[PDB]
Amino acid sequence: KPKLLYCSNGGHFLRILPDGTVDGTRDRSDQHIQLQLSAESVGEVYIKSTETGQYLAMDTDGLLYGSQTPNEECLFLERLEENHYNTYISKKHAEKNWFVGLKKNGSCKRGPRTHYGQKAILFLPLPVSSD
């Protein structure tokens, strides 16, 4: 686990499946839930689940998905929610403020149902590239 992400309240750990599906696990423990960001400019950053090559994106469906094409979709409107994490915003649908989080239960969302208000987006990165 040279790198992994964690949700504030959610207490889950985003995961990227090599099948082409995303989600969150109350506790990191899957084939590969590795994560990684690639900020390219304030209010616009990238994310690549370093492992298989899955870029954390959000299709028009508003459901976290992979995109082999890093452009106006894979990006993630990132700014600052608190003073540590990095609450992004589906740049593919920022007009709906479809943040990047996962129901504090164990199951991401899809479409209109991913807007901050508590602390289920506050993603705390805990990388440690040491292997």
Ligand SMILES: O=S(=O)([O-])c1ccc2c(S(=O)(=O)[O-])cc(S(=O)(=O)[O-])cc2c1
């Ligand atoms: O930031 S977010 O748009 O990913 C998001 C989404 C859902 C949330 C819910 S939910 O309606 O699924 O029971 C509860 C809470 S709470 O009051 O326990 O901190 C925070 C949430 C944050």
